[PDB]
Design an enzyme around this catalytic site. Structure first.
Site, short mmCIF file in Angstrom:
data_model
loop_
_atom_site.label_atom_id
_atom_site.label_comp_id
_atom_site.label_asym_id
_atom_site.label_seq_id
_atom_site.Cartn_x
_atom_site.Cartn_y
_atom_site.Cartn_z
N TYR A 181 63.20 -40.06 69.61
CA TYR A 181 62.19 -39.80 68.60
C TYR A 181 62.28 -38.32 68.28
O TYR A 181 62.20 -37.48 69.19
CB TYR A 181 60.81 -40.13 69.12
CG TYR A 181 59.69 -39.83 68.14
CD1 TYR A 181 59.26 -40.79 67.21
CD2 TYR A 181 59.06 -38.60 68.14
CE1 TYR A 181 58.24 -40.51 66.32
CE2 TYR A 181 58.04 -38.32 67.25
CZ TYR A 181 57.64 -39.27 66.36
OH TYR A 181 56.62 -38.96 65.49
N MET A 205 50.04 -34.81 71.17
CA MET A 205 49.72 -36.22 71.26
C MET A 205 50.99 -37.06 71.44
O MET A 205 51.06 -37.90 72.33
CB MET A 205 48.91 -36.69 70.05
CG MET A 205 48.07 -37.92 70.33
SD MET A 205 49.05 -39.44 70.31
CE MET A 205 48.28 -40.36 71.65
N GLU A 206 51.99 -36.80 70.61
CA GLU A 206 53.28 -37.48 70.70
C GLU A 206 53.91 -37.33 72.09
O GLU A 206 54.43 -38.29 72.65
CB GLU A 206 54.23 -36.94 69.63
CG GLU A 206 53.98 -37.50 68.24
CD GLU A 206 54.56 -36.65 67.12
OE1 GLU A 206 54.81 -37.16 66.00
OE2 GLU A 206 54.76 -35.45 67.36
N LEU A 207 53.84 -36.13 72.66
CA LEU A 207 54.41 -35.91 73.98
C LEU A 207 53.63 -36.72 75.00
O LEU A 207 54.20 -37.34 75.89
CB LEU A 207 54.37 -34.43 74.35
CG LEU A 207 55.21 -33.48 73.52
CD1 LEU A 207 54.76 -32.04 73.77
CD2 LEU A 207 56.70 -33.66 73.78
N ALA A 258 54.47 -40.42 74.79
CA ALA A 258 55.79 -40.72 75.32
C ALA A 258 55.71 -40.80 76.83
O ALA A 258 56.23 -41.74 77.44
CB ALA A 258 56.79 -39.65 74.89
#
Lengths: 156, 154, 154, 156, 154, 156
Positions: D6, D96-98, D101
């Site tokens: 990603y 947030m994405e981290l 994941a």
């Protein structure tokens, strides 16, 4: 197709070492395992530091954190969890690893040496494993089509 | 102001039994623990039947399925996970791992006479905190916090 | 009838500090929040030592390991996750994300004078609800519900 | 073997754009990345709608829901999470994405441009990452054998 | 001593409505359930608007997004998940599955007149316990435990 | 590259059976599905035991446990979750399976037969699915680049 494993197996006692070699050899021969890209802890010591000739590091919280995180990350980033379980030495060490693999959604596969297959395993090990096979079935195990079964033996 | 626990402790070896009694007695004295409503594995064996008392059930898969599930349910529906850890000698790693995955505070309790001895790397890393048995009666389970074990790893 | 929170708020910029004080004062007034037993990151820095006061610890991995773990443990062992969000300007996204993965209600609180301004898509999507600071004192944390931010996204 | 990522990276400021190009180029050259099947957000705008020339959609809760869900689904369905972190712009967006994941069991890899490597990163970014490398190591990074390390620099 | 629940029950068929009323009345009588602070889906439909009353909203994605999220948030922020299961006839499997993933005790309640009938394998396996409706009023939700359904599977 | 699925689909009613065949055929033709290594429940009955001519086993808690665990393990160890949803028979069975796949981080893909596409699906099914396609798009579906969309129809 092939699959990568985490090599959950201890190297501290005679019978652990014997089971280690046998499982390593099992996997080299299995065409459905990609052993080159699997995670084998002893090949992945933090900064190449050998705890046996450098035990000062056992008191080093940074080394401990690094090592711990690497093993988890080894479970998390491979397909299958492999647990070499010694019923007599009550499979001490891999409990947490097996539990972490279950939480990450991995097939958890216990392998017991044939000499010991049938002996009592712990409830939690029996419950957390998706399957429990003999050491000699490990070479012909198809990791592309992993299925569930019960251990054929006592559970304490 | 009252938390419930899962009583992760073995009852096979002499040491195990001695630590088992000390910890249970500690939990009774702790006003931040609600022991009536905690899960103690020995009291929740399937059909109220203990394997050690009726080894018949070593080879019964309904019993093992049910007891395994009951223990998981005891971890997940309670606030804190307690591990009575005897470093010299379980099934505890999977209980500890399951608690971690379920978002629970993981507290290891080590007998005073063993505290300082090396614990396994994974025990060390999965635990949120590590205390002496003589501290369990006064531990504030409403303000549980991270801390490092005062001891080495192997 | 009393929930505990994790106090996700920064303390670097002027705006951050002002929102920090307003929210803490709000939580004190809310009879559905149990603030004594909540986790406030500033009071739980490893060894009770604040980086900003002792920047020495910028380069200390034991301290950073311990403080990171303490904050995770503060999210997971508390009921609600609170994010003081200043839209014009954190580390907050990872705290918010970790709360979401741990099953917590994620409430963002935005200062009244900023409420309406665009918040980031991920902030918008990870939050269960988004309120004004002047609402925090009366929010019923025993009946927390989903609602959409009254504002745009960028 | 190859792996899909990603592409967690912003496109809003000068230095973000420069870091974006450098990371894209890094991955084309890396033989262990399958970039064709990776998820790059800008290639995956909902119904081809360009928010820059159509900002009316920023008030559209359906568009927001679709976009958000697509990015998550991009993290969830690829092997590795890639975070292009700009220490000066305090890496705003990918938190947030981290975090998501990490919750989905992905290797989280932060890449910082060499000009900025060594500058202070946030505690949570340091804690959530499995490794933090320089932009110029990204081309030679082996995603088939991803391991843990600490950032060599300050953590605030 | 008081747990909150998510009221997983349908309201379309006659049987569904009858089981709905019986269970709600049971929960009111149970002193270990805090019903005021529980999540009942019918009372938490987006904008307080019921699809069946205003089918307009069948084709509204904001409404469906918001109501779906509200129901997830109702599962995750409450202690127990309750499934009113009518074996002869939902959306319940996903609610049950989501509860399981969130670490909640999953209790199925089956009307007395249907208890014994075959339930689906997945319903059987996802549930921590399975009871009669006439038992719901006395179930101790502070000591929830695993047990097997007294009946077959299909 | 290819991907393995869990074949979430019932075999109990006329219209379920018709949808089953159509989906099986859809996947044989799709070059991005590895159907040989996918998990199709009926091919994975516990110890080859046929519940239809041996319904005594429906009262056997060990068989139930084995079967349940195998289906979960089928979802957990494959890439994608596939749900053949019959709107009229209100998609009864796969709710739990769909929910479990979501919890394991799988792309959840609902396929509805074209005859029924557009009919009302349940809120939870709509909410849990990452995408909802017609049966005839299933053959040309690219599972290497799975994306999010909404169902174009009613949600009850």
């Amino acid at each position: 197709p092939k699959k990568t494993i985490y090599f959950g197996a201890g190297w501290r006692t005679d019978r652990q070492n014997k089971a280690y070699k046998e499982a390593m050899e099992a996997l080299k021969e299995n065409p459905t395992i990609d052993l080159e890209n699997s995670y084998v802890p002893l090949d992945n010591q933090y900064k190449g530091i050998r705890v046996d000739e450098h035990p000062e590091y056992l008191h080093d919280k940074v080394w401990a954190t690094a090592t711990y995180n690497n093993d988890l990350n080894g479970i998390k980033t491979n397909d299958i969890m492999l647990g070499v379980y010694i019923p007599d030495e009550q499979g001490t060490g891999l409990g947490m690893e097996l539990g972490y693999a279950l939480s990450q959604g991995k097939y958890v596969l216990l392998v017991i040496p044939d000499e010991d297959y049938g002996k009592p395993i712990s409830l939690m090990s029996w419950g957390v494993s998706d399957n429990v096979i003999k050491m000699s079935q490990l070479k012909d195990f198809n990791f592309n089509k992993p299925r569930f079964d019960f251990y054929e033996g006592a559970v304490y």
